[model samples]
Target: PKIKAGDLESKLIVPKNNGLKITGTFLDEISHDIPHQNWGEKEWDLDFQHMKRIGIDTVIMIRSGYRKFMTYPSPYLLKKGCYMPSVDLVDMYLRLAEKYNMKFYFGLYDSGRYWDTGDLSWEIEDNKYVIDEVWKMYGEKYKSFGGWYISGEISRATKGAIDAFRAMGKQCKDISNGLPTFISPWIDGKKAIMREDAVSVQQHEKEWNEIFDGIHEVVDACAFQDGHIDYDELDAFFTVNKKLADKYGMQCWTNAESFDRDMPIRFLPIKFDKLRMKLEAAKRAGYDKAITFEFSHFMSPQSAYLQAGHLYDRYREYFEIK
Candidate 1:
């Protein structure tokens, strides 16, 4: 339907609803494309304060390690051809989470073998040792240690995904005495596809139904990354996601990414309206919580990117946070 100029009146327009705001964020110390700030405890502690000021009560480590680079100096991983990090980031994050009165979720290691071989099962062995070590070294002592993030991210049905997630989620829960576990998987929407066609909403729902049915017992929550689809497509996909989660008895969360995926540049802080639209869609879809793919580099006031600070200000203003 085409509209002419002055076809609609201001009285006819619907007002925006102030509903859900982002209350959790992933702490990315080991980034994929973004450059590291190389900050020590001083810098990290201040970042935690910044996060808490904006009503952030939950913080998730995106990944404990990616390939050789790790957040903590793990003896098991080091022997398995991982490098020693300059700082023990896991300890720093745990300490900061405790000081800020926030819950911390530990993310598992991604060995890169899966990417190389296209078999997620390869990750299970490496992370098994990593999980055990992490539990004994950090999870046991840290009061802030709240949950687990099975870091093997997948969009559609993949080989060995269900079994691998189950193995990792079960181990994390069993060791931690029934602590919750979650996975943040991206949507195979327009932006996410490479060579293949993107999956339809029906196809996505069907595939994930099987997946949720398989892993719902061990995995407690699913925070699907919300940036891959177009703005108009949010409700369609999020609706199905919420329905599936309800069916499987799992919590549905939206990874309302703070960074923009539509930009020509690899990534940067998202425009406030885009973030708001996603959050509103999540709220409408009845999502349990909203967590960003990050806070440190994308939404932090002290981020390396200058625009990130402005984003923080805009978010605070919109949410009426003091």
Candidate 2:
């Protein structure tokens, strides 16, 4: 694909289609060493195998801090000498995207989102530099592959961050000369994920959409702000987000909240009854797709939302793995 104008944008666009969309995050920054998580986790490869076996088709990743400290041979800043673990996460991502014929949506947290929790300035300079470079690299390389995300849960993306993304896209276009640099913000309609400085509709709730919409010209897609969802209250949930996505004119993606982990371990997790109901309702409500909170197995308070071992197999008995 030679460099061409808007080829990037055209490549980034998601044409309406019918497919069993399966999305997951791989980098589990919380338990960085736990060796399990959907947003960039070790078990995701296995998850891919399982997802394909169960009729899944797509997966997305953004805000994976695992590789932030690592250095690549190209133009990404990770400092001179840092505690960088050489786990080929990006390499694996590309390979997986190619192998499964899956889309690899990668992204960065907005600058100044406070990765050290509240420590906004903890590694300010280093983090910011790495963040920008990360954005730039992905913009140049990832377009033909799939799309990009903004920040997994960056509540506070500054004008500077927006500028950084635009610059990244521009330069990437200038270089490899063709590729779409789309962004996905990782907030799911929770007040907590809203930025303190984000425009507030009320005294309490911040109007994240306002801040984001201000710069909507740059981002390609925005995840529907409905992370912490109550499946029981499905009507109210879809009604609100469907409106938001419609208003934004951006394809709406649901992060987290749409998983029932028990499917993997117990083979019949998540009541099974609610499965089709949720998907059908979401489809009617106008969601681009639903993302899993995880991609692997886990046993906790409830059934595994991420895991659906043979859950879909029961959907059609004659379904083949291939």
Candidate 3:
């Protein structure tokens, strides 16, 4: 299957499409998501080729930062028996990203439980410790580790929440020596904009504007999660966020959740048609970058519901892939 020099170079490239232009996706530590008896070469190469084929220029390891449930090896956590064995998921992700010339974003967490913990300062403090450890272990190893993601998703819009995220982002910027940081916060689209809510619509707008302003100060970008919002709310949600992002001069991206949670305790793959539709809406609302919530369990080649193949089939037509 090797090609000769006659291959059409850059022929399939889309010029200024601006629609789904810079594709990226989140990847859980393989060991954490899949039931693998043992680690091997297969685990490392799982969906990297597929990612490259689909033009995924970035991959964010959004969670698993040697915390409540460890997903990577950490000497700092080893003494506490919180570290995994020899294989570090973040390390594995960066290695493959380098092999494919793709950018990788590492995740870090401190202490606030992701489940509705009103306080987030504890988690922000934990991130400082985690950042120091990560720098010690991997500072020189990954030239492409150019960014990091704050693992804790934001919920409260209060002043405390806003300040915590700002402080955390500032610390991230300082410790990474300006590598840039981003976070994926879920939005309750229906609740936020609903008339029945106690807060006035105008008040909601003010709250969100403040939230975006805080994040904008510390990080270079924010990739808002589109998973929790319904399809009807998708466009409006992105529009609001994008406007705020522009106001603060911050980059706005969408985290397209590619699965349905109808099945109890399991997430079924989403239809490629639906995924495409959402991305198109995002583009129309002025979002140029679209990164899915994941690619491994939901879109990997061996994924259930056969979405991996469907995605490739659609991309081949859309990107004009040979």
RMSD of each: 6.1, 11.7, 5.7
In model 3, pairs of residues that clash are 111-123
Q: Write down the lDDT that model 2 would get.
A: 0.45
Candidate 1 backbone clash number: 0
Give residue 310's lDDT in candidate 1 (0 to 100). 87
Per-residue lDDT of candidate 2, residues 1-322 (tens digit): 8667542322212223222244444333323333433344345566566655644455555444433344233243434433455565666666666677676655443233354454433333443454456556654455324654544244444434444445544443344334334444433323333133422223212344454455455554555433333455455656654565567675656544333433333222344334545555566676776654444432121224433544444323222223
Candidate 3 TM-score, true structure as reference: 0.82
Question: Which parts of model 2 have CA positions greater than 4 angstroms off?
Answer: 1-46, 64-77, 109-144, 152-206, 225-227, 256-278, 297-322
RMSD of 1: 6.1
Arranged by lDDT with the best first, the candidates are 1, 3, 2
The candidate that wins on TM-score is 1
Each candidate's TM vs. the true structure?
0.93, 0.59, 0.82
lDDT of 1 by residue, 206-316 (tens): 999999999999999999999888999998999999999999999999899999888888789999788988998998888999999889889998899878998997777
